[PDB]
Structure 1
Amino acid sequence: GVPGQVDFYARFSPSPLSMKQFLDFGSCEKTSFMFLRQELPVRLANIMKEISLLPDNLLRTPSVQLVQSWYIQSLQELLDFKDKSAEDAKAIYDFTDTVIRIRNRHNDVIPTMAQGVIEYKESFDPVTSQNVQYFLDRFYMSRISIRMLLNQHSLLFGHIGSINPNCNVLEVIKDGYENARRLCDLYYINSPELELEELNAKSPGQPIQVVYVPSHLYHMVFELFKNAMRATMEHHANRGVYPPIQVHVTLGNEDLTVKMSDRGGGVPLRKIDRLFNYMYSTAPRPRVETSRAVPLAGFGYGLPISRLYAQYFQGDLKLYSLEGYGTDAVIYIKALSTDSIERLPVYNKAAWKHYNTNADDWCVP
């Protein structure tokens, strides 16, 4: 059975790696094969059990059925190697090929799962919508983790893979700003300027670098800029004077922090968490047949996924807004590669109970 393969591997826990451990891999293709031939089936199988717990009307959508079919095909291909000899040179070539194969094929899972959620809302619940939120954080975090392993192995055996041991933080920030700004200019015919301030408390006046995945940092800052820009342009639309977006970067002993500050009018505290809510953030997918500029907010789960990127390596992404004034968004990244450990979801009794269960200890307002 294919349910049997899934059940067997889902019993196991994923094995989180530190950023330092990823970095030591890039220094032996055989040592990666032995790791990944178990780890990948375990990671795939754990998340696949949760897909199965989705509301039937979500599960049954064309998009989710497509995504599930991809996971099933991927598992079966990796489980073709379970016994195949560790000493065999063809098998490891075939593995690195299968990994490269799987990586370079399904870049589309994130918007496709997001289409499934649209298909779900369109044809059809508050009880099960808590399940959807729980699942999607776990699914997308799992995906980040699985993609990380596929990317490292394909880059090394196909800068230490996708890790830059010396990630230039301000450079990434400025690239994120310029790319967001181009989109802002397109949609609003104007855009806020950037004011960038830095403090290396660790070593004052020296460049701020960390061991990091640059494309992760990019996704986070690019998405935050888009959000800051939209808030700014929509708030000050009447005045025609648009306050800059202010970014403060600090390297401390333990935390790299990127604070992004806008004067876009804020959101009250009751509402601010909606920005991280999949069911609320499920906006229409921009249509192909138009020359009209793409809006800076909408489809694609930019903010919730940005936060998952922060949290993946034990960082965080927090928003706090002052309604009527503006918003601060703060990225927290671990300054030390040894503190940077994968945050991985695991399927077990506790995960299953979350889908099948549900603060009585406080009086309701």
Structure 2
Amino acid sequence: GVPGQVDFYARFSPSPLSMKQFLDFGSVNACEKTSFMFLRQELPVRLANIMKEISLLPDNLLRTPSVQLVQSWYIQSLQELLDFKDKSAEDAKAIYDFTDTVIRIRNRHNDVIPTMAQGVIEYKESFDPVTSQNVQYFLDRFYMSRISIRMLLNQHSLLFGKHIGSINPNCNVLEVIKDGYENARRLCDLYYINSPELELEELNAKSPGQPIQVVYVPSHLYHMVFELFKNAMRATMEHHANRGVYPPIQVHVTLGNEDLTVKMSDRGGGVPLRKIDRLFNYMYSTAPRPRVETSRAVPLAGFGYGLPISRLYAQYFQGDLKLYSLEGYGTDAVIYIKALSTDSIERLPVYNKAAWKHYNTNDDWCVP
């Protein structure tokens, strides 16, 4: 029975892999058998761990139709995977069947992020600061968990169903930045009828004058840069509306010994320090998606948690994404990525006593 199975697998801790390990596994004659042996335990472990926390959500959120749907997807995928814990690594039909199942799960779970977001809209619409700390804690973990699950599903599906699965061993950082800029720029032009130029500079400090490349998932880097350009572009177009002269977005890329850093600087007027963290708060940025039935351009901020999720992508491989704003002037956004694949280790949430306490808990400084 499901709670039995969820309880068994949720006792285990997820096991993080490094970018180097993902890479070395798939690089030369990736082994389907070996992948089966790992994932038939690991995917059920990851699924069960985060399912335990879906159960701790406020009842009015958990009971939303969109959250009920996501939970049912997880329940089904867990069950399908557990059909295989008894099968043999030597059973070629079992391996084939497992691979089919992984590919199928990959499709079922495609819409998980916006369906969850729709849940939060359903909950916000019909219904609290007591539990809004719980929702923030949950969504960071649920979306990081989903990122990690989708990584495994993609690796295995692409390897078995120059890139190694989703990984580019020589990801061209400036090319991805430019791709992000051009797509954000199209959306900026659609909405504001104008857009800032890009000024891009690079410094390869580790090997001066050489192209900057890292082992990375290019679509992860694309997501962060595109989301940040949208953010920088919106602030720029909104601050400079009256004068009608739009300062460019400036992007500085450096590869150091340990850090790849992408700094994005806008003159969009900034945000006071008191408010800057709202850009990463799910409840604060929970806005109804605009209707399909219109030709009016979609705004550069709104549905889908672009900015918190960008930061989760950065932090997933031990990187980070930080914002620094000077109110009345503009804002710097910085992506930090580990230069070395061996330093790029999955950051995975784990369900245990400490996680549970965090939902059922809540001072040494004077309250201002």
The TM-score, its normalising length taken from structure 2, stands at 0.98
Using the TM superposition, give the Cα deviation of residue 175 of structure 1 relative to its aligned residue in structure 2, in angstroms: 0.1
Q: 1:209 & 1:261 partners in 2: Cα distance?
A: 22
Give the structure 2 partner of residue 8 of structure 1.
8
Using the TM superposition, give the Cα deviation of residue 104 of structure 1 relative to its aligned residue in structure 2, in angstroms: 2.1
Q: 2:25 & 2:235 partners in 1: Cα distance?
A: 42
Give the structure 2 partner of residue 185 of structure 1.
189
Residue identity (%)? 100
Q: What is the CA deviation profile of residues 275-319 of structure 1, one whole-angstrom value per residue up to 9, with x for unaligned ones?
A: 000000101212100000000000100000000000000000000
**Aligned match for 2:165, one of 137, 161, 168:** 161
Provide the aligned C-alpha RMSD in A. Answer: 0.5
When structure 1 is superposed on structure 2, of 154-163 and 105-114 the one drifting more is: 105-114
Using the TM superposition, give the Cα deviation of residue 189 of structure 1 relative to its aligned residue in structure 2, in angstroms: 0.2
What secondary structure, in the 3-state scheme, does the structure 2 residue paired with 1:196 have?
strand
What secondary structure, in the 3-state scheme, does the structure 2 residue paired with 1:352 have?
helix
Q: 1:234 & 1:74 partners in 2: Cα distance?
A: 44
Using the TM superposition, give the Cα deviation of residue 105 of structure 1 relative to its aligned residue in structure 2, in angstroms: 2.7
Q: What is the CA deviation profile of residues 29-82 of structure 1, one whole-angstrom value per residue up to 9, with x for unaligned ones?
A: 001000000000000000000000000000000000000000000000000101
Q: What is the CA deviation profile of residues 87-143 of structure 1, one whole-angstrom value per residue up to 9, with x for unaligned ones?
A: 000000000100011112321111110010000011101010000000000000000
**Aligned match for 1:117, one of 111, 117, 120:** 120
**Aligned match for 1:228, one of 232, 252, 255:** 232
When structure 1 is superposed on structure 2, of 103-112 and 259-268 the one drifting more is: 103-112
Q: What is the CA deviation profile of residues 163-206 of structure 1, one whole-angstrom value per residue up to 9, with x for unaligned ones?
A: 00000000000000000000000000000000000000001110
Q: 1:253 & 1:295 partners in 2: Cα distance?
A: 38
Q: 2:247 & 2:336 partners in 1: Cα distance?
A: 25
What secondary structure, in the 3-state scheme, does the structure 2 residue paired with 1:347 have?
coil
What secondary structure, in the 3-state scheme, does the structure 1 residue paired with 2:264 have?
strand
Q: 2:121 & 2:278 partners in 1: Cα distance?
A: 17
When structure 1 is superposed on structure 2, of 58-67 and 104-113 the one drifting more is: 104-113
Q: 1:4 & 1:219 partners in 2: Cα distance?
A: 37
| Alpha-carbon contact 2:73-2:108 (below 8 Å) kept | no
What secondary structure, in the 3-state scheme, does the structure 2 residue paired with 1:85 have?
coil
Give the structure 2 partner of residue 67 of structure 1.
70
**Aligned match for 1:305, one of 298, 305, 309:** 309
| Alpha-carbon contact 2:16-2:346 (below 8 Å) kept | yes
Using the TM superposition, give the Cα deviation of residue 24 of structure 1 relative to its aligned residue in structure 2, in angstroms: 1.4
What secondary structure, in the 3-state scheme, does the structure 2 residue paired with 1:339 have?
coil
What secondary structure, in the 3-state scheme, does the structure 2 residue paired with 1:95 have?
helix
What secondary structure, in the 3-state scheme, does the structure 1 residue paired with 2:16 have?
coil
In the alignment, structure 1 residue 324 sits paired with structure 2 residue 293: no
Q: 1:195 & 1:176 partners in 2: Cα distance?
A: 13
Q: 1:166 & 1:349 partners in 2: Cα distance?
A: 41
Q: 2:89 & 2:339 partners in 1: Cα distance?
A: 37
Q: 2:290 & 2:179 partners in 1: Cα distance?
A: 24
Q: 2:126 & 2:105 partners in 1: Cα distance?
A: 32
Give the structure 2 partner of residue 206 of structure 1.
210
What secondary structure, in the 3-state scheme, does the structure 2 residue paired with 1:240 have?
coil
Q: 1:344 & 1:355 partners in 2: Cα distance?
A: 18
Give the structure 1 partner of residue 259 of structure 2.
255
What secondary structure, in the 3-state scheme, does the structure 1 residue paired with 2:351 have?
coil
Q: 1:275 & 1:317 partners in 2: Cα distance?
A: 12
What secondary structure, in the 3-state scheme, does the structure 2 residue paired with 1:331 have?
strand
Q: 2:231 & 2:4 partners in 1: Cα distance?
A: 44
Using the TM superposition, give the Cα deviation of residue 208 of structure 1 relative to its aligned residue in structure 2, in angstroms: 0.1
Using the TM superposition, give the Cα deviation of residue 343 of structure 1 relative to its aligned residue in structure 2, in angstroms: 0.1
Using the TM superposition, give the Cα deviation of residue 25 of structure 1 relative to its aligned residue in structure 2, in angstroms: 1.5
Which of structure 1's runs of 4+ aligned residues deviate more than 6 A?
A: none
| Alpha-carbon contact 2:173-2:212 (below 8 Å) kept | yes
What secondary structure, in the 3-state scheme, does the structure 2 residue paired with 1:260 have?
strand
What secondary structure, in the 3-state scheme, does the structure 1 residue paired with 2:108 have?
coil
What secondary structure, in the 3-state scheme, does the structure 2 residue paired with 1:216 have?
helix
Q: What is the CA deviation profile of residues 215-265 of structure 1, one whole-angstrom value per residue up to 9, with x for unaligned ones?
A: 000000000000000000000000110000000000000000000000000
Using the TM superposition, give the Cα deviation of residue 10 of structure 1 relative to its aligned residue in structure 2, in angstroms: 0.1
In the alignment, structure 1 residue 25 sits paired with structure 2 residue 25: yes
Q: 2:16 & 2:139 partners in 1: Cα distance?
A: 19
Give the structure 1 partner of residue 56 of structure 2.
53
When structure 1 is superposed on structure 2, of 137-146 and 279-288 the one drifting more is: 279-288
What secondary structure, in the 3-state scheme, does the structure 2 residue paired with 1:270 have?
coil
Number of residue pairs the alignment of both structures matches:
364
Q: 2:262 & 2:159 partners in 1: Cα distance?
A: 30
| Alpha-carbon contact 2:316-2:346 (below 8 Å) kept | yes
When structure 1 is superposed on structure 2, of 224-233 and 101-110 the one drifting more is: 101-110
Q: 1:249 & 1:283 partners in 2: Cα distance?
A: 32
